[PDB]
Write a protein that binds this ligand. Structure first.
Ligand code: 4WN
Length: 150
C-alpha cells in the first residue's frame, strides 16, 4: 500500500508532482494532493510567473481550470515544439500529473529537496516523496478525500 510522489524544484512556488511516475491523477485527486503539500492548484497567472523564473516540464498536469505543460525551450516531443504555457485542448482522457502552488516557497528558483508532506492526514498508505536527486522522505498517511479516487 504505497504511493511514490515525484516532485520538482519550485519556481515562484509552483512545482510538478507525478504519482508513481505515470499519468494517474484525477482532477479531484490533484486538488487533494496539493492540499497535502499545503498548496493549491496554480492559477494561469501563477504558472506564467513560474515559467518566467525557469520552470518547464515535459508532462501534462492540472492547474486551476486547465491541463498544461510549461515550456521554455522548443522540443518536438514536448508540447509539439511549443513554448509558453501550453494548454491541452483535445484529449479523451481524465488523468494527468498535477502542478501545485505553495505561497510560502522562495520567490524564484528553489531546487532544494522536499522533506515533508505537512498536511497529509492519518491513513494506511506509505507515501514517499521522491526528489529528482533521489532524496526520499516517507510517512504513513492518506491525502485522498474522494472515494472514486481510492
Ligand atoms: C519521462 N517521464 C515520464 C514520466 N515523467 C517523466 C519526466 C519527469 N520526471 C520523472 C522522474 C522523476 C523522478 C523524481 C523526481 C522527478 N521530479 C521526476 C520527474
Amino acid at each position: 500500500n504505497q504511493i511514490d510522489l515525484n516532485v520538482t524544484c519550485r519556481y515562484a512556488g509552483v512545482f510538478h508532482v507525478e504519482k508513481n511516475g505515470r499519468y494517474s491523477i484525477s482532477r479531484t485527486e490533484a486538488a487533494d494532493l496539493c492540499q497535502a503539500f499545503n498548496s493549491t492548484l496554480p492559477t494561469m497567472d501563477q504558472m506564467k510567473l513560474a515559467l518566467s523564473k525557469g520552470f518547464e516540464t515535459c508532462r501534462y498536469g492540472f492547474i486551476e481550470g486547465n491541463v498544461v505543460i510549461p515550456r521554455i525551450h522548443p522540443n518536438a516531443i514536448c508540447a509539439a515544439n511549443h513554448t509558453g504555457v501550453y494548454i491541452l485542448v483535445t484529449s479523451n482522457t481524465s488523468h494527468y500529473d498535477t502542478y501545485c502552488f505553495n505561497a510560502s516557497a522562495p520567490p524564484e528558483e528553489d531546487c532544494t529537496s522536499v522533506t515533508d508532506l505537512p498536511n497529509s492526514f492519518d491513513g494506511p498508505v506509505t507515501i514517499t516523496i521522491v526528489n529528482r536527486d533521489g532524496t526520499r522522505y516517507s510517512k504513513k498517511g492518506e491525502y485522498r478525500t474522494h472515494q472514486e479516487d481510492i
